[PDB]
Design an enzyme around this catalytic site. Structure first.
Site, PDB file in Angstrom:
ATOM      1  CG  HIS A  41      -0.435   0.278   2.520  1.00 12.49           C
ATOM      2  ND1 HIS A  41      -0.362  -0.691   3.492  1.00 12.49           N
ATOM      3  CD2 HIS A  41       0.024   1.418   3.093  1.00 12.49           C
ATOM      4  CE1 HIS A  41       0.144  -0.175   4.602  1.00 12.49           C
ATOM      5  NE2 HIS A  41       0.392   1.105   4.382  1.00 12.49           N
ATOM      6  N   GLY A 143       3.212   5.671  10.018  1.00 15.12           N
ATOM      7  CA  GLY A 143       4.577   5.583   9.551  1.00 15.12           C
ATOM      8  C   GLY A 143       5.273   4.313   9.963  1.00 15.12           C
ATOM      9  CB  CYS A 145       3.237   0.381   7.274  1.00 17.24           C
ATOM     10  SG  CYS A 145       1.602   0.476   7.939  1.00 17.24           S
TER      11      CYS A 145
HETATM   12  C1  W0L Z   1       1.248   2.225   8.079  1.00 11.79           C
HETATM   13  O1  W0L Z   1       2.287   3.129   8.498  1.00 11.79           O
HETATM   14  C2  W0L Z   1      -0.080   2.480   8.793  1.00 11.79           C
HETATM   15  C3  W0L Z   1       0.041   2.095  10.273  1.00 11.79           C
HETATM   16  C4  W0L Z   1      -1.255   2.377  11.027  1.00 11.79           C
HETATM   17  C5  W0L Z   1      -1.474   3.856  11.329  1.00 11.79           C
HETATM   18  C6  W0L Z   1      -2.083   3.873  12.732  1.00 11.79           C
HETATM   19  N1  W0L Z   1      -1.739   2.577  13.299  1.00 11.79           N
HETATM   20  C7  W0L Z   1      -1.231   1.760  12.398  1.00 11.79           C
HETATM   21  O2  W0L Z   1      -0.833   0.633  12.643  1.00 11.79           O
HETATM   22  N2  W0L Z   1      -1.153   1.725   8.160  1.00 11.79           N
HETATM   23  C8  W0L Z   1      -2.158   2.324   7.545  1.00 11.79           C
HETATM   24  O3  W0L Z   1      -2.222   3.550   7.448  1.00 11.79           O
HETATM   25  C9  W0L Z   1      -3.263   1.471   6.966  1.00 11.79           C
HETATM   26  C10 W0L Z   1      -3.226   1.502   5.430  1.00 11.79           C
HETATM   27  C11 W0L Z   1      -4.404   2.377   4.997  1.00 11.79           C
HETATM   28  C12 W0L Z   1      -5.243   2.690   6.222  1.00 11.79           C
HETATM   29  N3  W0L Z   1      -4.503   2.127   7.357  1.00 11.79           N
HETATM   30  C13 W0L Z   1      -4.842   2.168   8.652  1.00 11.79           C
HETATM   31  O4  W0L Z   1      -4.284   1.485   9.510  1.00 11.79           O
HETATM   32  C14 W0L Z   1      -6.004   3.063   8.996  1.00 11.79           C
HETATM   33  C15 W0L Z   1      -7.193   2.257   8.664  1.00 11.79           C
HETATM   34  C16 W0L Z   1      -6.995   0.887   8.678  1.00 11.79           C
HETATM   35  C17 W0L Z   1      -7.999   0.014   8.369  1.00 11.79           C
HETATM   36  C18 W0L Z   1      -9.219   0.547   8.027  1.00 11.79           C
HETATM   37 CL1  W0L Z   1     -10.501  -0.631   7.633  1.00 11.79          CL
HETATM   38  C19 W0L Z   1      -9.446   1.926   7.989  1.00 11.79           C
HETATM   39  C20 W0L Z   1      -8.418   2.811   8.306  1.00 11.79           C
HETATM   40  C21 W0L Z   1      -5.983   3.503  10.415  1.00 11.79           C
HETATM   41  C22 W0L Z   1      -6.477   2.700  11.440  1.00 11.79           C
HETATM   42  C23 W0L Z   1      -6.437   3.155  12.756  1.00 11.79           C
HETATM   43  C24 W0L Z   1      -5.913   4.413  13.043  1.00 11.79           C
HETATM   44 CL2  W0L Z   1      -5.859   5.007  14.739  1.00 11.79          CL
HETATM   45  C25 W0L Z   1      -5.423   5.215  12.017  1.00 11.79           C
HETATM   46  C26 W0L Z   1      -5.458   4.760  10.706  1.00 11.79           C
HETATM   47  C27 W0L Z   1      -4.409   0.897   4.644  1.00 11.79           C
HETATM   48  C28 W0L Z   1      -4.013   0.509   3.214  1.00 11.79           C
HETATM   49  C29 W0L Z   1      -5.248  -0.136   5.400  1.00 11.79           C
END
Ligand code: W0L
Ligand code: W0L
Lengths: 306, 306
Positions: A41, A143, A145
């Site tokens: 992603h 950040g 990921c």
């Molecule tokens: C990668 O750096 C990042 C890490 C997350 C940010 C907050 N905590 C994490 O572990 N991952 C993401 O940004 C993924 C990728 C897009 C959205 N996402 C999320 O984790 C957000 C999110 C996930 C799942 C869904 Cl169904 C909706 C939104 C997210 C979740 C929770 C918070 Cl507090 C912030 C953001 C992706 C391709 C899934």
């Protein structure tokens, strides 16, 4: 003596961690030999992440779109491909710090160390368990990921986890290093939910043995129980069934302490039915389930890694 | 989100760890530039350790008595001296992996990471706090002496602890890297006791703010309290007094959450007087006191190290 939630020394993994930027997405990559692994992603924009078609998105990409930072040295990407939910970026330089490694996929109930990273720079290290529902209870901010989870055996790093996302309950989901998700999750920004969890029974028993080894004995009893009768109590309190293989795995700890496995089950039963009545076990007022029998034996005997 | 007990990445310290053997004592040393630091009780035999005279013991020693192993390479000792309770072994080779470093002495209430080591080989990494009674609740077996505790700031390792001994309650005592013990302990094999401990109040409050940041709000209340009235409750439950500087240090967390420090004190008061009534905070059923305000800000915002 003493018992702590202990991670593996992170040095071998630190030397593999890089920064991957594409567009306005920055995350971490894992650099082994001449390949950088990272979540796919990274190729997504904000309106991409809602429901992306990653094959379409990737063919529109160029090697030069991928900016890879190894500390202060830029790595030239010379090829790219997708494998399930990870990207493999072929670079012109093999990582001279590549440890001996394996890509393993772990089972629910097993533990690993996470090296939390931002901008390719390690931030901290901590121990996680794969929950029965295939999530992990981590500590991850935006950040993070591409941070990986791993175990170390002698000199060999077994990578088992790459971080991808957080679910609405604040728990974390990701893939093995082949890019296959743990559990029924997808790297798509759409409402997903963890699914009901259970407590890892064999791990609680291991931790009770750690407690006994370290002098906490107040929960012991003369009582015993059968495996079947224990499992009727386990089911009620949302604990996983205990199998004969679990009993076998606990054998060494049982032999060291001289407490039969089924006797420790009788103790756990009373703890489940009675609570702790104001007392603690190894500094906790809850039954702890993220130490495996292996973790207890390592810590309560002294295994190292070189 | 998420909140975990997190250690610093250990790589920089791993590269400093060596094995020191003298007689039939083996422990760990810390190799920085051309000096290896280790506990002075490495020069002791079994009948020495009961009440040794270390100056007498050291003059009888020779450079060649000290066998220093850096992995599989032997380090020739070319000089030796004692500084308080540590030995400084001058070797013919400067450690090419010497990070930038400082020798700092920490305060009770402050935290650090421990890299547990055996035979010069790192075993695991975990976070400790210096208790108010100058002990630490660690995980140390025979052979772990000379393992160090440290913090990392940017690229600089601040060493604050070297491990020496375990006390009869299973807690751990050691020195700063100048060889001065934390607390009223001596490296002599004779009955010593920790002394009564207290709970680190400012740290509990920091952890309550971590909980709020991560969505745990059930312990919040409309109530408030004065600092004086809070400290009367703190004293009763064996908590440290809260000072105005503690309040000031909690300012950023108070501003992020919008919960006044004295309001969070009112919450802690009710938790102390009422318990938790079956509920948990950040996965714990006890009030946790080994996270500093700094630790909470680092983890709940994302600081790294390069
Ligand atoms: C990668 O750096 C990042 C890490 C997350 C940010 C907050 N905590 C994490 O572990 N991952 C993401 O940004 C993924 C990728 C897009 C959205 N996402 C999320 O984790 C957000 C999110 C996930 C799942 C869904 Cl169904 C909706 C939104 C997210 C979740 C929770 C918070 Cl507090 C912030 C953001 C992706 C391709 C899934
Ligand atoms: C160094 O490798 C070693 C580490 C301890 C072994 C068990 N846990 C540890 O942290 N340190 C020692 O062996 C020190 C040095 C002689 C004795 N010693 C002890 O820790 C033992 C001991 C300490 C203090 C007193 Cl008053 C008596 C005995 C000890 C304590 C507890 C256990 Cl479970 C085993 C051994 C020394 C010069 C103090």
């Amino acid at each position: 003596s003493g018992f702590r939630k202990m991670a593996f020394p992170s040095g071998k993994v630190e030397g593999c961690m890089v920064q991957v930027t594409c567009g306005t997405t920055t995350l971490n990559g894992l650099w082994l030999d001449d390949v950088v692994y990272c979540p796919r992603h990274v190729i997504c924009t904000s309106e991409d992440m809602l429901n992306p078609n990653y094959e379409d998105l990737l063919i529109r990409k160029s090697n030069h779109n991928f900016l890879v930072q190894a500390g202060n040295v830029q790595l030239r990407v010379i090829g790219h491909s997708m494998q399930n939910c990870v990207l493999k970026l072929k670079v012109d330089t093999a990582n001279p710090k590549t440890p001996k490694y394996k890509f393993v996929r772990i089972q629910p109930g097993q533990t690993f160390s996470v090296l939390a990273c931002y901008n390719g720079s390690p931030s901290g290290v901590y121990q996680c368990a794969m929950r029965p529902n295939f999530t992990i209870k981590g500590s991850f901010l935006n950040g993070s990921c591409g941070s990986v989870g791993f175990n170390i055996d002698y000199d060999c790093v077994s990578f088992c986890y790459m971080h991808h996302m957080e679910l609405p309950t604040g728990v974390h989901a990701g893939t093995d290093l082949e890019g296959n998700f743990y559990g029924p999750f997808v790297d798509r920004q759409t409402a997903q939910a963890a699914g009901t969890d259970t407590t890892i029974t064999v791990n609680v028993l291991a931790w009770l043995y750690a407690a006994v080894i370290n002098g906490d004995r107040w929960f012991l009893n003369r009582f015993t129980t059968t495996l079947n009768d224990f499992n009727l109590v386990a089911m009620k309190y949302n604990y996983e069934p205990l199998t004969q293989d679990h009993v076998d795995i606990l054998g060494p700890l049982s032999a060291q302490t001289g407490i039969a496995v089924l006797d420790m089950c009788a103790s756990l039963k009373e703890l489940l039915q009675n609570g702790m009545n104001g007392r603690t076990i190894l500094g906790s007022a809850l039954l702890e389930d993220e130490f495996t029998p292996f973790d207890v034996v390592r810590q309560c005997s002294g295994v190292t890694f070189q």
